[PDB]
Structures are given as C-alpha cells and as structure tokens.
Design an enzyme around this catalytic site. Sequence first.
Site: not given
Ligand code: HEM
Lengths: 707, 714
Positions: A79, A242
């Site tokens: 982010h 993810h």
């Molecule tokens: C189309 C783009 C993407 C969308 C819409 C998206 C969205 C989301 C949403 C809605 C969450 C959960 C926040 C929460 O409730 O805690 C999340 C988490 C997460 N995102 Fe994505 N994301 C995208 C891309 C990315 C990218 C590019 C990466 C990093 C290389 C990443 C990494 C993570 C990680 C590791 C989590 C897990 C967080 C945790 O365990 O607290 N995301 N994302």
Amino acid sequence: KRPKSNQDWWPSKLNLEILDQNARDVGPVEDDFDYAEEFQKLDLEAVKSDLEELMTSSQDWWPADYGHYGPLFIRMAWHSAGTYRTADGRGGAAGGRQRFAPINSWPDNANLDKARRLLLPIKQKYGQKISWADLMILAGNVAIESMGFKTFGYAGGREDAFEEDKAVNWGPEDEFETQERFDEPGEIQEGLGASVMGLIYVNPEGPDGNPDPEASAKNIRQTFDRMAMNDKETAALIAGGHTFGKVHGADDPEENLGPEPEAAPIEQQGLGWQNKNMITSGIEGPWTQSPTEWDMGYINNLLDYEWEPEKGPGGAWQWAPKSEELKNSVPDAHDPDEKQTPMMLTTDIALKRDPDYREVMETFQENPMEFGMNFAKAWYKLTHRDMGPPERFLGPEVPDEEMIWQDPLPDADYDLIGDEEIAELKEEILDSDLSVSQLVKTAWASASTYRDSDKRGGANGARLRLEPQKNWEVNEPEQLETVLGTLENIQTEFNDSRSDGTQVSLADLIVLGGNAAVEQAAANAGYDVEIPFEPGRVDAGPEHTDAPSFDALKPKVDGVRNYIQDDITRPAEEVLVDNADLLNLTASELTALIGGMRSIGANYQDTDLGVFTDEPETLTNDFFVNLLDMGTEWEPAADSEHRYKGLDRDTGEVKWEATRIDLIFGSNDRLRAISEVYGSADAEKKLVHDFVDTWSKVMKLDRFDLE
Amino acid sequence: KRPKSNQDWWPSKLNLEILDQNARDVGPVEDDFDYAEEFQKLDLEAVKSDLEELMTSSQDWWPADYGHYGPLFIRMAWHSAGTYRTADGRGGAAGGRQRFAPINSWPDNANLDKARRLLLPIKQKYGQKISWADLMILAGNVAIESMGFKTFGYAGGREDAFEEDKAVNWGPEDEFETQERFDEPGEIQEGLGASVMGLIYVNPEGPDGNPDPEASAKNIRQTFDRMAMNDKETAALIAGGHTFGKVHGADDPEENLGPEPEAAPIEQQGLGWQNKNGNSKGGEMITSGIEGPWTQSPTEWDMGYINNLLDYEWEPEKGPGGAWQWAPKSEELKNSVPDAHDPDEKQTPMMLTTDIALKRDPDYREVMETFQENPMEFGMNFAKAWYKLTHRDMGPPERFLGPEVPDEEMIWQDPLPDADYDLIGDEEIAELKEEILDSDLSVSQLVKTAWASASTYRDSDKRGGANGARLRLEPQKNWEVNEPEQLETVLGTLENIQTEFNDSRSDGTQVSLADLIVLGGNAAVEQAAANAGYDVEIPFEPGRVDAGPEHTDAPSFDALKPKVDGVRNYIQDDITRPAEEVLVDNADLLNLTASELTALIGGMRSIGANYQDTDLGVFTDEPETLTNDFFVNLLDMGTEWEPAADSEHRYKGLDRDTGEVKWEATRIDLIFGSNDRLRAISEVYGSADAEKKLVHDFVDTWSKVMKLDRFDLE
Ligand code: HEM
Ligand code: HEM
Ligand SMILES: [Cl-]
Ligand SMILES: [Cl-]
Ligand SMILES: [Cl-]
Ligand SMILES: [Cl-]
Ligand SMILES: [Cl-]
Ligand SMILES: [Cl-]
Ligand SMILES: [Cl-]
Ligand SMILES: [Cl-]
Ligand SMILES: [Cl-]
Ligand SMILES: [Cl-]
Ligand SMILES: [Cl-]
Ligand SMILES: [Cl-]
Ligand SMILES: [Cl-]
Ligand SMILES: [Cl-]
Ligand SMILES: [Cl-]
Ligand SMILES: [Cl-]
C-alpha cells in the site's frame, strides 16, 4: 473554531501552496544532514534481524494472525508503494507519506496504522540511520523472506517526508469509497491511478460494488498500467501477495469500526478504526491453507476449483468454492480450535475469468519458477519505481543488475573536459550559427522533463535526442534536429581533436550551450555573469530507454516556451504551477524564470507571446515593467481560448500579445507582489541573478552522480 | 480543479499551517536584507513630494473626485490599519496585507484596489527603500497634509508581507456582508474587531442593515474599543476622516459592480468591482452603494462635518444605490456641494447611520459638542488619534524609523526607559548566574518565571516580552497564570541579588531585574542540561531595562493575558476551543514552527515547570533533568491513554497490562502523540540517537523566545 482559507472563499484560487512546500522543509532535520551518508552507517543485517524477530513477536494491542505479522507488513509495504501514478510520478513509498493525512486515513489503509506502530521500536532504535520510508519497504521484504521466498534485491535511500504532498490531486470525489471517475470499466479519467477515491487501485468487491470479475479485470488492468505494470507483472503481484495472509471482516465495518485516524479521539494517539466491540476491509477469510508460507496455494485454489459469489460475514462480496473439498481446510488466525474455508475476492476471480490474465495464470501454475521470478522482479520494481536512476539506490542489497525501469545510464568511459575545454566549447557554440533562443530552448527542452516526484527525466542522458522526445510536438522536431545536428558536429570535431583521452557528451554540450546563451543575453543587458557548470552527463542510447514509459513526461503546458496544448482541461496557469512543483520551484523562482525568459524569447514556434520587450535575447526586467504598466490595458483575444491582447489604454495601439501563463503574474495577488519587486527601478540586477540561479538549478536537478 | 485539502476532509484538523508560515519567508527578498537600513537611505521628503503631486494628477481609468485623490487615500490608509484587533494584535497595516486575499476582496475594501494601483509608479520608483505598508500610510498622511492639516508625525519600518496571515480568524460567517456574531448591538462575540464579516468595524447603514443610530453607536463603541480606541479618539477619527471626500453609490453595487478582485477575470490584472458603465465614469462611480459628500468642501480640512451633523436635523431614506442614508430635513444645504465630476452640477450633503450615531449617542454627542466649540481641540485629538491608529501595530519606540518620528513617545507604544549605567560583562554574567543558582530558587521556579516574563510577546503587534520586566507590574503580577504569591517570592530573591550586585559595584555597572529574570532562566536550563550530562552555553545579551507603572498602560496589557500556556500546562476552565488549538495559536505569536513548539514542550516537561506544580505531562522520574523522556514515554505503546473521570482536561496514562496509573496529562501533552505531523516530530526526538539534538533544539527555541522583543539590539 478556525480561520477560513482563501481557497474556501475562492475555489479557483491558484494553488500556490504546492510551491510554498518547495520553499522550506518542515520537520526538525538539519539542512546539512545527509541521509545517504547516514544510511551508509546502518548495519542492514542488524535491522533485518530485528524485523525477523518482530514477525513472530505478537503485541497484545493487535495480535498477530497465525502468530506471524508477515502478511500484514506485506500489505503495508504494497500500500505504501501502491499510490504511485505514472502520470505525474506522484504518490508512492519514497516519502513514507502513508503516515500522514489523507493517506493515513484512507479506507484502504485501515488498520495499517497498527502495522506501522509495530515498527516504532525498531525505528526509534536505529534513528536517522533508517527512514520510515526505507523501513516500511524493508519490513515487507523481511516478511516475504521469513516466509520462504527470496527477494530480488533492496535499496535504501528514501528520505522521510514530514507532511503530505499538497500537489497530489487524488480525484474529483468529495467522499471516500465513492467514484465519479469512470462510466465504463477501463475508461477511468486520465491522470488517476485508482478507480475509487481512497482505494489503492480498485474496489475489491468489483466495479461500483458489483461482483463482475470480467469488468473488474478491466479496471485492474488500467490502474496497474497507470502504475507502470503490465499483465504478467500485475498477475504476479496480486497472486504473489495473496499467497499470504487473509482479509478481515468479522462484521460490518460501517457499524463496528470507530473513526479513521484523523477523526479519532486524542487518547487513541494516532490510531484509528477502533473496534467498537478483527475488521478491516469487511471481507473475511484466507486465500490459502498455509497463509504464512510461500507456495502455489493461491494459484491452485483459484484455478483448480469453481467459485461463486456470496455475501460474507462483513456484508461484502467475496467468493466461495462450489464444492466442499476446501471446507475448513485452513486454521483460524487466532482460535487454535477452529478452522476456515479459503475465499477469493472478485479481483482474484478477475485473473481467472479475463482471458488474457488466465493465460498468464495458467503459465504460472505450470511453472512455479516462472511465477516466482515474475513476482520477485515485480515486487522489487513496485517498491523502487519512484526512486529514480541507479545512482540513488543505496546499500549492500542493491542488485548488480540495473533494470530498464530505472532509466539506467551508461558509464562515461573517458576523461571529463576541464575549465579550459569548457570555455573553448562555449565559444565554439556561440561561434556557430545557433541563436541565443535556439540554445536556450534546446537546453530547456532537455532539462525540463525532470520531475522530483519519482526522480525521472532531466538533461543527463540527452534522451531529448531519442524517441519519443525527439518527436514531441512541444520540442518542434525539425527545429530540434537542426540544433542537435550542429551540436553533434561540435562534439565530433572536439572528440577527434583530442589525444589525451578526453571526450565531451552531447548531453553536456546542450546544457553548456544553454548556459553560454544565457550569459550572452545577460551580457547584452550589461551584466557579467558566470553560470556554474559541471560536466559528467552521459549520452544514453535507446537501449537505456523504455520509450513508451517516457510518454508520461510529455508536457501539455510549458511556461518557458509558452506552449499550451489546445486540449488541456484545467486553466493553463494551474498546469504551469503543477509543472513548476515538479521542478521543485517556489513561486518566486517561477516568476523570475518566466519573466526573465520572456526578455530572452524562447517561445514554441518563435511566437511573440509574452515577449514584452523591444530587445529580444537581452536579459532584463522588461517583462515586469511592461506587464505592470497601467498605460496598457488587457483583453481576451477574439476567437481564442488562451490568448490576450495588451492595448495602449489611450492610443489603442496593440502593443503586446500574451497567454494566461504570462498574465497570471499580474493577476494573482501573490504573484503580482513578486512581479512588482522585479518590475521596480533598482531590481533588474536582482532579477538577472535570480533568473540565473533558477536556470542553473533546473539544469542540475538530475545530477545525482555529483551528490 | 485542485487537490482537496486535509482541512476539507477533517474540518477539526490542527491548523499547523500557521506555524509553517514561520518556517520560511515567501517572496524573493534575501534573508540578509535589512529593511530598516534600506529605509534609512530613503529621501522621505522626495517621496512625499511625489505623493502630493500624485494627489492632483488624475488618471482617466479612475478619475479623481473633486480633482483630488486625497480622500480616497485617507480611506485606504484607514482601512489598512483598521483591521487591527487588540485580542491577538493581528490585522493592522504593518504588513500591507490589504494587498492579499481575503482582505483585498472584502466588500468594505471595494475600489481600494484602484487606490493602491495609483501608488504603483511611486512604489516602483523607490523600490526596496519604501515598503507598500509604509507607503500606504504615508499616502494617507500626505493627503491630509495637502488638504490643510499638518500631521502629528510619521514612522517607517513596516516590512511588507508576501502573503496573507493564515492565523487570523476573521469570524464565523461563511458569507461576506453577513453577521452571525451578535444578537444585541454591543454584544459582539469576543475576539473579533468588526460586527460584520468583510467589514472594517461596522455596517455603515446600521446594525443588521437597520438605520438605528443609537444601536449603531453600541457597535461602533465596542468595535473601536477592540481596536484600542476610546470615545474621544473614536469620534475624533470618524469626524476627522469624514471631513474629507464622499461615499459612492450611483447605483446598486449588487447588480452594477463586477466580481471582487479574487474572483475577477485574469485580464483585470488584480483589479475588481468592474463597473458595468465603465470605471472611467466618475459620475457613475459605485463603491459602498451609498452616495454623496459629507461637507461642502470635500478636499479641505475644516469644521464642515461636525457643523453639518450637529447644526441640522437628518432623516432616513434610501439613496440611489438602494442603501440607507440620511438627508437634511430642511433645504438649507440643498445643492451646497459641487459635483465631484460634473463642472456644471451641484450635490447635497449626506450622513451615514454611523455618523448620526455620534449625535444620537449621549456620550458621543458631548464629545462632538466640545469639538464644535473648540476646533483646536478637535484637531489635537484627531492628529494624535490618526498617528496612534496608523502606528498602533508597530510595537515599541525602538522600531519607529525616519525623520518624522516625534520626540515624544506615547503610552500606547509601551515605552521603555533608558539604562543609565554600564551593562554587565562576561565576568559579571557568569557571577550572577552562579549566584542565582546558589539561591534557594529551584530550576523549575527560575524557568517558570523567565517564561512568565518572555511569553507575553506576540509578533502580530510586537507588544510584550521580557524587556521592561512588566511581569512584576500590574496587571501581570496578579495574573492567575503567574501564581502571584509564588511569583512575589521569586522576584524578591532575584531583587535581593540585584541589590547586592549593584551595591557591590565600584564602577558604573548595574544589572536590571529584567535581565536577571532571563539570566536566571538561562542558568536553570543550562543546569538542567548539565544534570543530563550536557554542557550547553545559552546565548545571552544584557540591556533589558525595568519599566515602571509610568511606562505602562496597565489595562491595555490585559489583552496579553493567556487562557492557555503550554510551557506551564495551564488551561483556563473557560476556553471554547480545544486546548491544543489555542496552543498552536499562541505558538504562532511567538513565531514558532511546529518543530520548535514540539522541542519546547517536550523538553520543558522533563524539566517540569507546571502551573501549581502539577505532574501533568511530566513523563519522567527525574524532573529538572533535560532529556527526551517525554517523547520516549509518550510513545511507549506499553502505555494506554484515556480521559480522566470527572475531569475537564485531565487524561490518564495507564499500564496497558497491569492497569496501573503511570502518568497524567492534558491535551497539550497528548496532541504531540495524536496529530499526524506532530507525532512524526515526536518520533524523531523520541529516538535513541536524538536526545542531544532535542537538548540543543530546546535551547535554541528557549533562547529565541527570550530574545523576541530585543529590538534594541537590532
Ligand atoms: C487488484 C489489486 C488488489 C486488490 C483489490 C487487493 C485487495 C485486498 C483486500 C480487500 C485485502 C484485505 C484487507 C483486510 O481486510 O485486511 C487485502 C490484503 C492483502 N493484500 Fe491485497 N489487493 C490487491 C493487491 C495486492 C498486491 C499487489 C499485493 C502485494 C504483492 C498484496 C497483498 C496483500 C497481503 C499479503 C494481504 C494480507 C494482509 C493481512 O494478512 O493482514 N495485495 N488485499
Ligand atoms: C464607525 C466607522 C466608519 C464607518 C461605518 C465608515 C464608513 C464609510 C463608507 C461607507 C464610506 C464610503 C466608501 C465609498 O463609497 O466610497 C466611507 C468613506 C470615507 N471614510 Fe469612513 N467610515 C468609518 C470611519 C472612518 C475613519 C476612522 C476614517 C479616517 C480617519 C475614515 C474616513 C473616510 C474618508 C476620507 C472617506 C472618503 C473616501 C472617498 O472620498 O473616496 N472613515 N466610510
Ligand atoms: Cl476567517
Ligand atoms: Cl516544522
Ligand atoms: Cl538532523
Ligand atoms: Cl503522496
Ligand atoms: Cl473497481
Ligand atoms: Cl466503488
Ligand atoms: Cl471459477
Ligand atoms: Cl531521463
Ligand atoms: Cl530512439
Ligand atoms: Cl523502447
Ligand atoms: Cl511548465
Ligand atoms: Cl515564494
Ligand atoms: Cl484530492
Ligand atoms: Cl532582496
Ligand atoms: Cl492581516
Ligand atoms: Cl501557549
């Protein structure tokens, strides 16, 4: 209560505050402090070792999921870098601005206030040796490494900001989590990196909140493209990210989370979203069976099973497997005696249902090694894209390989010209048939592409002579070719006449020619000025240039050349100020630059627009004297969108022609006050020198090699 | 299109931009430029000659009434200084900010854009030798002088600003020419100098637009009082000013005047209120919407105003501009005045509701009667009031420059006596600090007293400060915030030292209590730093004098009394705004940046100099030891904060685990761990490698505040 700002009274008032930000560095850091030198003192391995321990050191105020903060830090780091826009190079992780409003309170950054807070002890421990900006990215790297995946590299060097960047326009919406920027997916308003106000890239539930994967894919593709990522990079980043962690939405956010940080009570001490009864996005569940381990879990779960949309416990769209083969296959993040079923977001299903993303995902699944490398390189690119050229990358983990997106530069395998050769070359240039205007215009065309936001552009490399710059309308291709041809012959003749191994680059000749021309114009006005010059710029080739990526630096407005693309949406002066900020100019420097420039005359297509003087190519304060002369009256030019006529109030004589770029300096209250200074009886010498100082400043903006 | 400000998203966000304004000086002026020195090079007489010449040199784009710009320039100068408020000392003419938004576009400043524009040639001619601020006031003086009235004096020294003062809150209204600050006339919300947003003092037609003279007088009296003027001065100023010129209202300004400057087209080049019929038409001129002259000879000093007002009966009516104005009940004054532009036309005098108010109000009437009976007294009072009006925001005598500064110093200048003795040298300074530290006074007492002395300074009108030691005089000696009884004890000890020092001198050397208070504060700080292992030497310059009650207008200093004091963690149980907002407001008056304020408060809390010696914000187990404990402990997540039960300002720092009450604090302390920007600063000072930096930054800010009023050393 609070004073009402002038922008409140007059919404269209020129936003000079963005230039004021260049007039001073808020925060307690000493002006002579050098972060690069301080970072060099840092024991990177020691910081990484502490970060690794932190990963499994759960803190009671925000218990670690699965006993590992890794995923949370990855999201935090993603982010931080994820707000970057190629349009103006703004946003990004370089200033660690996720720490300040409005970004710190964006809905998409919910609970990242806790993630950043976890790093406070380590930040305090190392002090100035590592910035928050560098630390947040490093935290992401260590998280990834600790969970079984080796990173491609890491560079320090991001200097911390102490306030927001007032120049970033995040969008037209007056409300977070709403969008007034696209009617059809993939047709987002130009200049914006996200499809919704307050989100990093797109809506996780789908466009406009509809769980349509194919449509979501269109906004995913466009937003990532606007963040410099193509299909393979985008799929690798989303799938790679993810592969870790989960989404949080135990209940509805709107009714269960307290005020965002900026609106939270003083006792919360910077934290926000206090749970009234974990809830973050409002979506709930892990993507994989082992959320803290790098594997093929995300890709396999996505492709090998059928998914259907549903409303989760948080009232948000999310997808579940049609069968029960994955039912309760994941341990609960906190309850040891409980399990969960994997879930997929609409944005994940998008990678499967969009035909082009699907081909990439299929390839990644079949070969984990390709998936891995693509992710490793894209993560490196993502987290370093706003840091500029290779010279700025610091530390023991900087890869030996320089990537094309860094706009790399070749080494100057030759001795640099000395004071004698410099003076020699300057005379040779002024001896040529090139006019003062040609030289100034060319030097400006070369240096003016620099933008301090992501440190791209500038005169070093002489990319002005390569695609796409050599053919930009604003650079007048045919005129440009003439100047470069002449300078090239001077370079050739000089390099051949040498025997001591000395050589001069075309990049340096352009800037030297510009300096010579300005000094000449000053001389024509009776002033003897010596403009500082430092050789060393090199000539980059097409192999060091990702041409399409440079289209992002193409200007729609150029004050110095009085160029205005007849298509701009904002008033010309607003774009002018926007552009001035990228050159790190203050309102005074901008005024001195434009005013001084008009006495020299370096306009696009050699027009007389704003050239309020009888002696062109003579550096004086004629621009201000004539602009402020009440003997002249101004009126909009008939059948024109940007031009005005300056008429003698009495005789009616048409004395001048001008654009809004010229006239704003006699209209805006603050700019007019600066103009009055330079337009005064005993101020010409000051204007000459202030113009020279600003000219020199711009010519040297990208000289990271001399730092 | 433009970025949405954080203020838009969060209206209650701390307004740190007012402190950012202190972090730099916008504009092209070099840091080493000294205006005082440049002004000295000016040939004041030469400038006045050009000004007088300009007075009758009518420009066609804005024709001069009666062929004389004098009255217009008087109004210009009056309005420039007329925004002054004693509450915070803000507003005024010292920065010539009438040139920048929002002031340049207030309805009451209509067409003053034309007035200032007429002065451009002269401004350009002399350049840096005379500021716009000094020039506008000088223009007012020359206008008056050229029309038969010698001025009391004039001083230069007002340095031009290059932007508005973001710290001035002009009112709650969201629309110009509307008022939401008073129910009953004379009951205007405290802190405001005007009764209507966008107006200098009051509505010329009367309160809420009603032609009620008696009601009007109530707002006139209160607004002028808040601008430091009494009945006599107020009547002298209004009567004196309205002895010249006319009001313009050929038609309704609401439909015949173009957009104000800030909203006007770019081709207008800074001007606004474009007249539909053309600015060239003197007979169609519109400004306030009210039309007509006050006297028969608008460009001559005389008793015309007072006579017309008192010697005739006036009645309400709607003028040609659709605004309330008064006309003679009889026809003895009919067409008694020449038309300001038509050589073959005559006009009839008029009075504003605000003028009639001076006649209807019992007290104002008495003053006006006396003025009419004693033309010489009228002149005396107007001359001095005009001088006071145009110089009230320049501070002490030391700041008045030029050959026209009267030898006589006025009480409103907060005069200071000369030091008739040799100042202490390096040796004495050292001896005095040791003696002070050798006394039974604690570090906290010394620091608290030095702050009580210097903290009254405000850069807005440059009043206050440690020079003069007015802390020991009324009313400061009895201010609740200064803990009178406690203060008396400290001053007594310091005075005893002054006594023994002065008595022990065989030469002509003496030391003032003013200097000893500051010297003692410096000593205490150096001591606290030493207790922390840091050897620091705080810059010190003697020379402060001890002013007496004869040099002090006691009541006027009430305006400097604080409702909040960060250094002393004092919060008056009456403030309407959150304590941290007042803290920032006050920090601005001390010219502090957000970083200086942070270093100051954080460092101060490790010393512990709180009002009534509370432990509020004192996050350290070693008071009087200058360290970064405040930041370290404030940032420790092991501590959780919550509002104190049954308390208006207290909060408690509890051990997140055990629940033990570790600390107590106020919003002044906690804002540094809450606000996004201040927290970023706290994190710096709260780092393991920043204690030394905190100490030195604290010292620099302390030293800066102690020297704010040292104009004598400039
Ligand atoms: C189309 C783009 C993407 C969308 C819409 C998206 C969205 C989301 C949403 C809605 C969450 C959960 C926040 C929460 O409730 O805690 C999340 C988490 C997460 N995102 Fe994505 N994301 C995208 C891309 C990315 C990218 C590019 C990466 C990093 C290389 C990443 C990494 C993570 C990680 C590791 C989590 C897990 C967080 C945790 O365990 O607290 N995301 N994302
Ligand atoms: C209760 C306070 C006052 C009110 C409501 C008030 C009001 C007004 C109004 C409405 C106008 C006409 C603006 C226009 O149409 O052109 C004007 C002008 C004028 N005012 Fe006052 N005023 C006050 C006091 C003062 C003071 C204190 C001075 C200076 C010692 C001054 C001096 C002048 C002069 C010289 C003019 C005439 C300008 C000209 O001919 O163009 N006024 N005033
Ligand atoms: Cl306001
Ligand atoms: Cl700051
Ligand atoms: Cl520093
Ligand atoms: Cl940003
Ligand atoms: Cl979307
Ligand atoms: Cl949406
Ligand atoms: Cl599916
Ligand atoms: Cl480049
Ligand atoms: Cl090419
Ligand atoms: Cl290419
Ligand atoms: Cl530009
Ligand atoms: Cl500036
Ligand atoms: Cl925005
Ligand atoms: Cl200067
Ligand atoms: Cl002001
Ligand atoms: Cl305070």
